[PDB]
């Protein structure tokens, strides 16, 4: 098999809230 | 598929200190922290706490200050959970999880059936 | 923090009929950066690591049969199984992650009759 995705953006930046674009 | 997998089962006396695994194998182990879910006999699911598959730091909730503690290896792709000074109200089962952004757990393990007594 | 509770802790239904358990927050759930509530829903049946079914409190996974069902948002959130089949012989519990550290719900039981 084609190693797996899913690894995407984000990264590891403060759990206790989420991570995905806070726009300006 | 994707998959984790933890050590066997253990067995321990009042007082001693263990150590269970959880190996995966699917996906970039580091790209996807680790957590660890408890479960008494019977009873609910405790939120451990997680390490950061990188910055390879622990966060521990409350009720698993110290004493508890986690690591990983992040090589053989395994992150640890060990214990110290067990108690007979520290048997119960473990877990070790896939965590995403997303906020939930695609893929747990099987967990640790570890008990302790005399 | 958030404190957690599902409800009822217990049901009994029958083949082929519809389910309402519930899952109350405690705190607030909508998280406002991203418009999702970060509720998620887990099947545990006996022995198996618990599943999720649904994520954003509404969103089903990539797996879970379309017959299960998250609704809620805010602070009511509640989960359905049309036709519940047998094998749904589960027990469902939810968890926040909005303010962690997570919290589960004491779960409810799915039980069958027949």
């Known amino acids: 098999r084609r190693p797996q995705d899913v690894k995407f953006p984000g990264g590891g930046q403060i759990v206790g809230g989420v991570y995905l674009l806070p726009r300006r | 598929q994707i998959q984790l997998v933890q050590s066997g089962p253990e067995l321990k006396k009042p007082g001693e200190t263990v150590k269970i695994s959880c190996k995966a194998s699917?996906?970039?182990?580091?790209?996807?922290?680790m957590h660890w879910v408890n479960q008494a006999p019977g009873k609910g699911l405790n939120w451990m706490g997680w390490?950061?598959?990188?910055?390879?730091?622990?966060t521990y909730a409350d009720d698993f200050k110290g004493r508890f503690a986690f690591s990983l290896e992040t090589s053989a792709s395994t992150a640890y959970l060990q214990i110290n000074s067990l108690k007979n109200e520290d048997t119960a089962t473990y877990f070790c999880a896939r965590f995403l952004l997303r906020q939930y757990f695609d893929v747990w393990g099987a967990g640790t059936t570890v008990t302790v007594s005399s | 923090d958030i404190v957690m509770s599902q409800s009822p802790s217990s049901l009994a239904v029958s083949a082929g009929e519809k389910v309402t358990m519930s899952c109350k927050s405690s705190?607030?759930?909508?998280?406002?950066?991203?418009?999702?509530?970060?509720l998620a829903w887990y099947q545990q049946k006996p022995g198996q690591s618990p599943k999720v079914l649904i994520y954003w409190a509404s969103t089903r996974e990539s797996g879970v049969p379309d017959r299960f069902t998250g609704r809620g948002s805010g602070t009511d959130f509640t989960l359905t199984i049309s036709s519940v089949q047998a094998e749904d012989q589960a027990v469902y519990y939810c968890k926040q992650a909005y303010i962690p550290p997570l919290t589960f719900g004491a779960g409810t039981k799915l039980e069958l009759k027949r």
């Open positions: 390490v950061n598959t990188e910055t390879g730091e622990p």
């Open positions: 699917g996906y970039t182990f580091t790209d996807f922290s």
């Open positions: 705190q607030s759930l909508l998280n406002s950066r991203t418009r999702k509530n970060y």
